[PDB]
User: Which sequence fits this backbone?
């Protein structure tokens, strides 16, 4: 009803939407907080650090801090274990091989917005971004 | 002169060099004032700084209430004795040397001034005007 | 505090037997956090103050009571720590002899006589507070150096108190017949090395702020320049960054006297850099610099600093004497976590005395405040207020 | 130390007074005194007493 | 030890909206953090209340207030000793009161908001003082006790018993037209009814006041000066012992105000007690035997001093400081430019300004005559004289508002004009109106000093002009005339409705801009001091009011002042200390000597 479209912009690790971006936030439009603290008190508590996107919605007298996104994120998703580190473990450089099909099984999902010859382009693409897969596929 | 002295002052004969003692002519408890400095006076090897009518000096109280003795304070010369000369042509003089203890701004410590007061001082220091009887 | 003993029995791996002498009300508060209910203390008083009844009659003595602890009456402002208890009743006669068993008895502590704590629950947190100091509140920040021409005292203030930590001292130059017989310069050179080593070790030389360098004569100034000479030699940037921990003072007397000559006399001190208002003043500046240009990079008050911390924007923490020593105990735990918590997110720390203009400004602000490294807007929301 | 000031008064537990027969004032009270002390007497355990509790 | 101190908080409800702030006052205060009482919320009227007992004096709340609704001050317990009355929580409170004395006239002088008006009511029996407390159901008894140690104690016993019923000449000048019509019907009716005194009194009183023309007119119809005088007539005519006048100089012209002063003084001769409040020092000096000074911040508080002499009280007033109280009541001292002080320039601009020929304007009941004069550029001309002389008419003609019966003045020039009597007739709010005239004038620092910060227009910005006040509106109007660029600016009677500080802000305003901008200005005035500061030349008007009048060409300050003051026959020697005009009595040797010299006033100039 009294609604519109997204904004696609985070900023941060700090939850509660950026931090207090759970509160200015009606200020030309017409919303207030429909996770914009409770599914954002599930934003970074969900995917702590690094950022990803936030796509605040404006759907019905209430925003929506939408913490959708894609790769980078889904890239290091190339793994199977990462027992945290607390803080300051000397960078904890997680880089070491992966599975085969780096591509139509890990970029056919990130295709579309990439341009030109699919694989040759995109499928190739994702590869380089593996700076954290540090050791390349094998 | 200096602070709180609204007005300029035409030169008048210097009557009182450092070391001179004038009568204290207020009701502050001070009996006399011993001049140790003149404000705004200049420098020449061997010259004593010396005050005149309506000059602000720096004095100590040689005779007077002990709460006033043993310290240096500002005073203002109100009567002279060394004769001086005004721009109406007159050479005039008082019977005594005398001034009144005062603050850097120029406020009297006391509330009366006993005896006369020369106009050139009255004209210079308003709170002195206030407390003056016969002027000149 | 002065700890006479402290031993670890063979029959008890855990607890301890501590004989100790509290020296000031900061050391009363230390005792407090060590002593548990059901621990034992043997102290002295002065009981024998009987009936009449058969005989006169009393006797006198100086009778020492082994009391088991049951309760405490603790008043920090009043400099009053008191332990209530029952006699342990040393039926063995070795202790408690001359006291009449079956009768409660109290200990108002004094700074005069030491006492023994037979402890059950001697933990690592108490041990810190017994051998590093125990001001989790921090009042001080000072060290001094008096030198005459022949005697020196390196003095020093505490980790907790106006309580000396280390009375150093060298061979000081004494104005000899010749040009000041070269032994002067080498021996003075030694002292700097001796004082730098002691302060490095004793402290975490990031806890003290002040060295006052005090002399009758040019000695102090000579020594300052000598400090920073040797500083450039070693490329000792712990010293070279920091023209603000040494402050150069003259005095007549220079034994332990000299310090109180320097301080309390308006020659060399006032509210300029003595360095126990140092960074205390500098950060409380910057705190209002930010807060009055409504920038969101300074925040204030027990409610508001804890929230400015939840957002994890804060660097220089502003804490007080008043809100601590005004009356309240417990409360200062909360703020101590809150300093670490905040630093675990960013920052140093400044405790200001409220006995002064600056501490009073911050006290009108609940005695707790911050400067942030970065703006974090609307820290007063989530938590509800202004 | 100031510390203690008023320790005991502030730590004695309140107990409110009780509600009791009003005592007469004046001449009547003297009367009560004279009858209590002299007329129907009371005890004389050994000699006499003017208030014990259990004896 | 340390001296004693207090905290007092006064909050303006007009300025406060708790919704926007939130009850932020409570949240921010450090006392309430602890669990204390300093700020309590009143659920009813929905206002913040600050208790003076619990408040710290921190001032944290003041800064946090978004508007500037709260004010906390720290006093040495100067106010606490004196408490007479208070309007309510966090409102104006009055301190001390003026002594009344029989057979004499006691003056009162102060800046607006001091409680001079309030004080009259208390003495009048109209209002009963609460004593900064509950006192309400007629507790006159308590008031005498509060007054003990003061001479007012006797008066309060008299008032309660109702032996004496004081007659009051109402203060608010704007309010009166609405209240009375006719008095019922026409001023004449009022004077006949009220006349307890002599039949001579009806005629005599009217003659001296120059009421002859005005009798037939109705009260509502009356102009400001006329309106004032009828009230004065009734206060002589009445039979009583105590005659209270509250601001009798308001709206009146220079000649008339002096006349009012003499007549009022006549009461003292019959040994009747008189009390008076004045904004004008010339008037105040003449009337009074004794004078009180009322000081303190406007609308916050105002204390009355101990009774003083006429000469003495005036002298202390001008210093801006009072010793016992030890308060510098006025931030800056008043000074007048010597004329030595002024800048020296060759003036003409384009060779002189415009010039006007002889002019005449005849209504058919009044005739104005004007003598050809010249105006020059970057100059200032004062216009003086009594009202009804056509001072107003002349300015209008130059404005082009009025067409001359004869003569013509068609200038090329752009003119800005400010009218004399200001009554609102503009729809819109204050900010909107001033912004249309010019924004950017609003930006200047000069305008911050004089208008915006003193009054606090920010709060006025939303308010309607109909809803507004008199003096506040006046400063705004003067400023607005200055808002737009013009070769020549015209202002008519800027002193109305303004107290001492307010007028003097205006004096600085006209002189500084004109000098700087190099433009010319004509200012009409009754106030002696204002004319002196601003002007370089003057036009004096003469003739008989409400009949005919005449104007003169501009002439130097010395020349013009002698003519004007010669018409009055009061010399204002000089006081050596204050440099103030000192009035001279009629037939005298010292005053006689001056008449032969031609010196009505003195300044820091050469002269005998
Ligand atoms: N009804 C009221 N409620 C609260 N405060 C009031 C009320 N009437 C007057 N006051 C206060 O008393 C003071 C004002 O009036 P008074 O009428 O006593 O002033 P004055 O001293 O005559 O000043 P002015 O020269 O401005 O007329 C004001 O500053 C105002 O704060
Ligand atoms: S006074 Fe100011 S801060 Fe307090 S409620 Fe009103 S508007 Fe808000
Ligand atoms: S001044 Fe301070 S203490 Fe008083 S009401 Fe305001 S915040 Fe509370």
Assistant:
């Amino acid at each position: 009803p009294n609604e519109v479209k997204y904004l696609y912009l985070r900023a941060v690790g700090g939850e509660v939407g950026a931090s207090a971006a759970l509160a200015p936030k009606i200020g030309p439009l017409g919303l207030s907080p429909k996770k914009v603290g409770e599914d954002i008190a599930k934003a970074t508590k969900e995917f702590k650090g690094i950022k990803v996107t936030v796509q605040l919605k404006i759907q019905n007298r209430q925003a929506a801090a939408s913490v959708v996104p894609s790769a980078s994120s889904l890239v290091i998703t190339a793994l199977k274990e990462p027992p945290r580190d607390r803080k300051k473990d000397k960078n904890v450089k997680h880089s070491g091989n992966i599975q085969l099909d780096e591509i139509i099984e890990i970029a056919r999902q990130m295709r579309d917005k990439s341009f030109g010859r699919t694989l040759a382009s995109v499928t190739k693409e994702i590869l380089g971004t593996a700076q954290s897969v540090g050791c390349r596929v094998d | 002169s200096g602070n709180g002295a609204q007005g300029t002052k035409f030169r008048i004969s210097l009557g009182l060099p450092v070391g001179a003692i004038m009568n204290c002519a207020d009701n502050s408890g001070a009996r006399n004032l011993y001049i140790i400095a003149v404000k705004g006076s200049g420098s020449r090897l061997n010259r004593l700084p010396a005050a005149s009518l309506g000059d602000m000096v720096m004095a100590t109280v040689k005779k007077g209430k002990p709460e006033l003795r043993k310290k240096v304070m500002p005073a203002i010369v109100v009567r002279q004795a060394k004769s001086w000369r005004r721009r109406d042509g007159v050479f005039l003089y008082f019977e005594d040397n005398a001034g009144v203890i005062a603050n850097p701004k120029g406020e009297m410590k006391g509330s009366a001034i006993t005896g006369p007061v020369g106009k050139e001082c009255a004209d210079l220091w308003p709170r002195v005007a206030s407390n003056s009887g016969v002027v000149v | 505090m002065k700890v006479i003993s402290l031993k670890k029995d063979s029959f008890n791996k855990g607890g301890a037997v501590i004989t100790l002498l509290p020296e000031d009300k900061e050391d009363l508060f230390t005792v407090y956090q060590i002593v548990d209910k059901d621990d034992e203390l043997i102290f002295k008083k002065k009981f024998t103050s009987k009936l009449d009844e058969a005989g006169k009659k009393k006797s006198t003595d100086l009778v020492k009571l082994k009391i088991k602890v049951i309760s405490e009456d603790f008043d920090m402002k009043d400099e009053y720590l008191k332990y209530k208890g029952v006699t342990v009743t040393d039926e063995s006669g070795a202790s408690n002899v001359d006291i009449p068993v079956g009768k409660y008895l109290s200990f108002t502590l004094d700074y005069v006589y030491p006492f023994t704590i037979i402890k059950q629950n001697f933990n690592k947190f108490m041990q810190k507070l017994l051998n590093e100091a125990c001001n989790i509140e921090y009042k001080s920040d000072t060290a001094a150096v008096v030198l005459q021409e022949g005697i020196a005292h390196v003095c020093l203030v505490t980790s907790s108190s106006t309580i000396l930590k280390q009375k150093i001292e060298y061979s000081m130059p004494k104005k000899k017949r010749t040009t000041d017989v070269l032994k002067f310069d080498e021996k003075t050179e030694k002292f700097y090395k001796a004082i730098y080593s002691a302060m490095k070790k004793d402290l975490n030389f990031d806890k003290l702020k002040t060295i006052i360098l005090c002399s009758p004569g040019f000695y102090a100034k000579i020594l300052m320049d000598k400090i920073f000479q040797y500083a450039e030699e070693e490329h000792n940037k712990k010293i070279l960054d920091n023209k603000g921990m040494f402050f150069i003072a003259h005095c007549s007397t220079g034994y332990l006297q000299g310090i109180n000559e320097v301080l309390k006399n308006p020659l060399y001190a006032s509210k300029l850099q003595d360095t126990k208002y140092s960074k205390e003043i500098m950060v409380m500046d910057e705190f209002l610099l930010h807060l009055n240009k409504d920038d969101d990079k300074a925040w204030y008050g027990e409610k508001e600093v804890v929230k400015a911390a939840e957002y994890g924007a804060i660097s220089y923490l502003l804490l007080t004497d008043k809100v601590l020593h005004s009356d309240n105990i417990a409360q200062r735990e909360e703020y101590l976590k809150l300093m670490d918590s905040v630093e675990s997110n960013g920052g140093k720390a400044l405790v200001l005395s409220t006995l002064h203009s600056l501490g009073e400004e911050l006290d009108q602000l609940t005695g707790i405040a911050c400067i942030l490294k970065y703006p974090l807007p609307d820290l007063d929301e989530d938590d509800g207020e202004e | 130390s100031l510390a203690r000031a008023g320790k005991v008064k502030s730590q004695t537990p309140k107990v409110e007074k009780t509600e009791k027969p009003k005592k007469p004032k004046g001449r009547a009270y003297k009367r009560l005194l004279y009858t209590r002390r002299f007329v129907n007497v009371t005890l004389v355990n050994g000699k006499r007493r003017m208030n014990p509790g259990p004896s | 030890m340390s001296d004693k101190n207090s905290r007092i908080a006064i909050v303006s409800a007009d300025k406060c909206k708790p919704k926007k702030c939130r009850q932020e006052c409570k949240r921010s205060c450090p006392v309430v953090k602890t669990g204390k009482l300093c700020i309590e919320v009143t659920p009813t009227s929905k206002i913040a209340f600050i208790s003076e007992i619990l408040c710290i004096g921190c001032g944290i709340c003041v800064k946090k207030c978004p508007f500037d609704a709260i004010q906390i001050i720290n006093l040495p317990t100067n106010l606490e000793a004196h408490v007479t009355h208070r309007y309510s929580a966090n409102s104006f409170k009055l301190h001390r009161l003026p002594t009344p004395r029989p057979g004499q006239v006691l003056g009162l002088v102060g800046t607006n908001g001091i409680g001079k008006s309030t004080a009259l009511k208390i003495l009048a029996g109209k209002q009963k003082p609460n004593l900064g407390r509950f006192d309400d159901p007629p507790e006159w008894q308590e008031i005498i006790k509060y007054f003990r140690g003061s001479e007012l104690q006797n008066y309060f016993t008299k008032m309660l018993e109702d032996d004496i019923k004081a007659i009051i000449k109402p203060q608010y000048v704007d309010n009166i037209p609405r209240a009375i019509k006719g008095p019922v019907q026409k001023v004449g009716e009022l004077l006949k009814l009220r006349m307890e005194k002599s039949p001579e009194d009806v005629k005599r009183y009217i003659k001296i006041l120059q009421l002859e023309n005005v009798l037939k007119r109705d009260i509502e119809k009356l102009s400001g000066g006329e309106l004032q005088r009828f009230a004065i007539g009734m206060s002589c005519v009445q039979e009583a012992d105590v005659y209270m006048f509250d601001e009798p100089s308001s709206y009146l012209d220079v000649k008339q105000r002096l006349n009012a002063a003499q007549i009022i003084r006549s009461l003292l001769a019959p040994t009747k007690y008189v009390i008076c409040v004045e904004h004008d020092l010339s008037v105040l000096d003449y009337l009074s035997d004794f004078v009180c000074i009322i000081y303190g911040v406007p609308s916050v508080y105002g204390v009355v001093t101990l009774p003083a002499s006429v000469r003495e009280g005036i002298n202390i007033f001008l210093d801006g400081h009072i010793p016992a109280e030890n308060l510098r009541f006025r931030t800056e001292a008043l000074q007048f430019r010597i004329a030595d002080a002024t800048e020296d320039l060759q003036n003409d601009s384009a060779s002189r300004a415009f010039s006007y020929p002889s002019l005449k304007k005849t209504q058919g009941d009044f005739v104005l005559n004007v003598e050809e004069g010249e105006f020059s550029d970057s100059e200032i001309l004062v216009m003086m004289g009594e009202n009804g002389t056509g001072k107003t008419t002349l300015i209008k003609l130059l404005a082009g508002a009025l067409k001359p019966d004869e003569g013509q003045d068609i200038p090329k020039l752009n003119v800005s004009m400010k009218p004399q009597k200001i009554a609102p007739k503009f729809p819109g709010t204050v900010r909107q109106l001033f912004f249309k005239k010019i924004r950017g004038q609003f930006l200047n620092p000069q305008f911050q000093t004089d208008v915006v910060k003193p009054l606090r227009i920010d709060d006025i910005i939303d308010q309607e002009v109909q809803h507004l006040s008199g003096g506040e509106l006046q400063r705004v109007a003067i400023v607005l005339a200055l808002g737009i660029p013009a070769d020549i600016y015209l202002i008519d009677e800027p002193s109305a409705y303004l107290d001492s500080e307010q007028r003097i802000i205006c004096s600085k305003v006209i002189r500084r801009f004109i000098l700087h901008n190099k433009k010319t200005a004509f200012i009409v005035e009754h106030d002696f001091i204002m004319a002196t500061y601003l002007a370089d030349k003057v036009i004096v008007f003469e003739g008989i009011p409400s009949k005919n009048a005449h104007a003169r060409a501009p002439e130097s300050l010395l020349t013009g002042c002698n003519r004007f003051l010669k018409n009055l026959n009061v010399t204002f020697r000089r006081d050596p200390n204050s440099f103030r005009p000192r009035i001279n009595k009629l037939d005298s040797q010292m005053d006689k000597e001056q008449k032969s010299s031609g010196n009505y006033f003195f300044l820091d100039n050469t002269g005998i």
About this structure: The first strand of chain C starts at residue 2 and ends at 7. Chain C touches chain A through eight residues (CB under 8 Å). The radius of gyration of chain C is 26 Å.
